[PDB]
């Protein structure tokens, strides 16, 4: 349990805005934006872009709990991009359930987005990836320790899916986006 720092040192402020762009530069791609995805009208599904040039749109950390002013690692925390496309209720990350691909993977909106599917209630989290550089981000499935990883699932749809995984995690750093 300690603060959660970015790329320059500096703590994590709730509210603040960050790109979330990969640890190791250069195979890996760019930071996490919106697109469309299986028939979709709407760009709600989260994709992480194929090219390091692509920062992507800035996200910001929001606690539900009570707040110290700081993130720490392994506290629940909210997701959501700082723009948001209008046929999206909300910005605020959550995870749905794609069949097609058999992945519950991070997207945005509300209900009216995610017609004939699945979407998971719960929390993120923040941790230390354990070896190395930076960090990874956590899905913890609503008021229970069944907690996943998120991990990476390339699709083919000019980028890649965050998605819960029990397997390799995707390890990330988080940039003052300003």
């Known amino acids: 349990v300690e603060q959660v720092l970015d790329i320059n040192g500096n703590p994590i402020f709730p509210g603040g805005k960050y790109y979330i762009l990969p640890a190791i530069r250069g195979p890996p791609g760019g930071g996490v934006r919106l697109d469309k995805t ?19 749109l800035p996200v910001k950390f929001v606690i539900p709990g009570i707040s110290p002013g700081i993130i720490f690692t392994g506290t629940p ?11 999206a209720e909300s910005s605020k990350w959550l995870i749905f359930v794609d069949d097609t691909i058999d992945k519950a993977c991070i997207g945005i909106g509300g209900p009216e987005n995610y017609s004939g599917k699945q979407t998971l209630s719960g929390t993120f989290n923040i941790q230390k990836y354990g070896s190395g550089f930076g960090y990874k981000l956590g ?18 749809e000019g980028g890649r899916r965050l998605n819960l995984t029990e397997h390799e995690a995707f390890r990330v750093v988080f940039v003052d986006a300003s």
């Open 38 to 56: 299986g028939d979709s009208e709407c760009p709600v599904t989260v994709l992480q872009d194929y090219k390091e040039v692509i920062n992507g």
């Open 77 to 87: 925390i909210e997701i959501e991009f700082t723009k948001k496309p209008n046929c």
């Open 139 to 156: 899905f913890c499935v609503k008021g229970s320790p069944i907690c996943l990883d998120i991990g990476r699932y390339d699709n083919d």
